[PDB]
A paper describes a structure:
The actin capping protein (CP) specifically binds to the barbed end of actin filaments with a high affinity and prevents the addition and loss of the monomers at this dynamic end. CP caps the filament with its two independent actin binding sites at the C-terminus of each subunit (“tentacles”). V-1 and CARMIL proteins directly bind to CP and inhibit the filament capping activity of CP.
With the exception of the mobile “β-tentacle,” CP has been considered to be a rigid heterodimeric protein that is stabilized by many intra- and inter-subunit interactions. Superposition of the two structures was poor, with a root-mean-square displacement (RMSD) over the Cα atoms of 2.55 Å [residues 9–275 (α) and 3–244 (β); the “β-tentacle” was not included]. This unexpected finding indicates that CP has conformational flexibility. Therefore, we conclude that CP conformational changes are not induced solely by the binding of a ligand molecule but show that CP is an intrinsically flexible molecule. The larger domain contains roughly two-thirds of the CP residues [residues 1–258 (α): 1–42, 175–192, and 235–277 (β)] and consists of the entire “N-stalk,” “α-globule,” and “β-tentacle” motifs together with parts of the “central β-sheet” and “antiparallel H5s,” whereas the smaller domain [residues 259–286 (α): 43–174 and 193–234 (β)] consists of the remaining portion. We refer to these larger and smaller domains as the CP-L and CP-S domains, respectively. Each domain superimposed well across the three forms (RMSDs of 0.80–1.06 Å for the CP-L domain and 0.80–1.04 Å for the CP-S domain). In addition, we chose CPβΔC for crystallization, since the “β-tentacle” does not participate in the CARMIL interaction. All of the crystals were grown under conditions similar to those for the ligand-free CPβΔC, and the structures were solved at 1.7–1.9 Å resolutions (R = 0.184–0.213, Rfree = 0.238–0.263).
Residue numbers in the entry:
A (entry chain A): 8 to 276
B (entry chain B): 2 to 244
Amino acid sequence: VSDEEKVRIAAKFITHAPPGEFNEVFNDVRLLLNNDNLLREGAAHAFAQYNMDQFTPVKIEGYDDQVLITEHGDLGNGRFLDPRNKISFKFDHLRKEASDPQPEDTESALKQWRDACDSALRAYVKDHYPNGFCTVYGKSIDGQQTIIACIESHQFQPKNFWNGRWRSEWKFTITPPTAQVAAVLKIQVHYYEDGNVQLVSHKDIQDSVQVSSDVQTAKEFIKIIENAENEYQTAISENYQTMSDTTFKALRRQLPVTRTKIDWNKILS
Amino acid sequence: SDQQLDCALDLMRRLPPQQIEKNLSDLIDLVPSLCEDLLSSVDQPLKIARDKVVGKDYLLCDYNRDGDSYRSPWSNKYDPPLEDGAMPSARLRKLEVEANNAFDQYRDLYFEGGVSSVYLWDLDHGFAGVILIKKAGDGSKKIKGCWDSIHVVEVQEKSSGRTAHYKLTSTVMLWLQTNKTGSGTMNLGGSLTRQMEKDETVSDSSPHIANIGRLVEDMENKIRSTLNEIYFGKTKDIVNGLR
Ligand SMILES: [Ba+2]
């Protein structure tokens, strides 16, 4: 198997690190590949893709709250946009370090919609997620004005050998008098205090809403998000119950229909 | 190459358990020299083949593999046919047949369907074997499910001969996948491994198959409860901690 294949496999594994376990997986993959220069060349894109896929939140010196690393904030050449603070910053994907904040702008047509939606969203997020973070972008994409709202919330407990993260991405395409809504909600949990167990879940959402002013419509946007995220969370818990009490039992009973453990002398006779 | 092997095993504890066979294959391509070490230390999802002579399914794993063929526990031959595939002694084959019939009944009682297979092999001072059970749900239900049990037992038969030491290493892999309007797609997957060791009287009142049966039953019941607690308790608690 060629060096090109090996580093393809290395890059893939790195992209599949569970939330909160990047360092562990990277060091494993580094020592197995055992060719740092090849790793740097064939797999650099993977470090960046992981953080953007994960919506990694980052602290920036001099600014309150945290900003998400997403594709929507990628400015090229290692820099990312903080659209709330109106700055760009260099991001080190390996160390997860923000540096060199510089003043920036991008879109301004949607400045007021982005600002209305961010204010409404930030309150929503801080109300519903223990340590949630959000970043809201406004862009023209393939012809159309789009508000994109990203939400992240994680709980890492490496000393109890578990990690979890929630991500949701909500795209509002503004074609007054309506906005089309497309979203994907994601959850990932890894528990390995015993042996490897993971929950991976996603849900796609499609809706539409009536646009008015920036303020009223932001409110409308948040109501849609709040309801769908509540709906999804309730449904996840309902499904666990069905699984725990029905499907699981259908794989293996606790005990045989005899309602006691096995009479082995009967089996063998 | 111990550092590399440690990294390989650790990595397997972290990659998504839904992709085991693929990940192990990729991991060996990544470190070819660690192949035998990894095939020997990482459990793989069980696969089904058909024994057409007896009309019964049987289970494939590395324990009944010789080259690119697999041995049926029903007919005691390899598919494809081999020149000299590894086979048990006559003595051990009789025990293998009895264990397959015992575990079919055990499977019927606890699982009410699925497939079982028992493969035994001779050792210098006793024998060893694997008891395999695979049950899948009804895949017309919005909630799909697979359970694989892989129970390795190592028996040191002590001269004499009315005593033996049993070591049992058991892995259960459990996967559940649902696709619902309300919860979108949920995929819950993983595995738990446990080990035990015990000395037992071997007699007509307590033959090897009864001793092994009780160890497997005790262990699998315990693993089922642990899975119940982790899958539907602990991961659910984590999700609800996120929002
Ligand atoms: Ba082994």
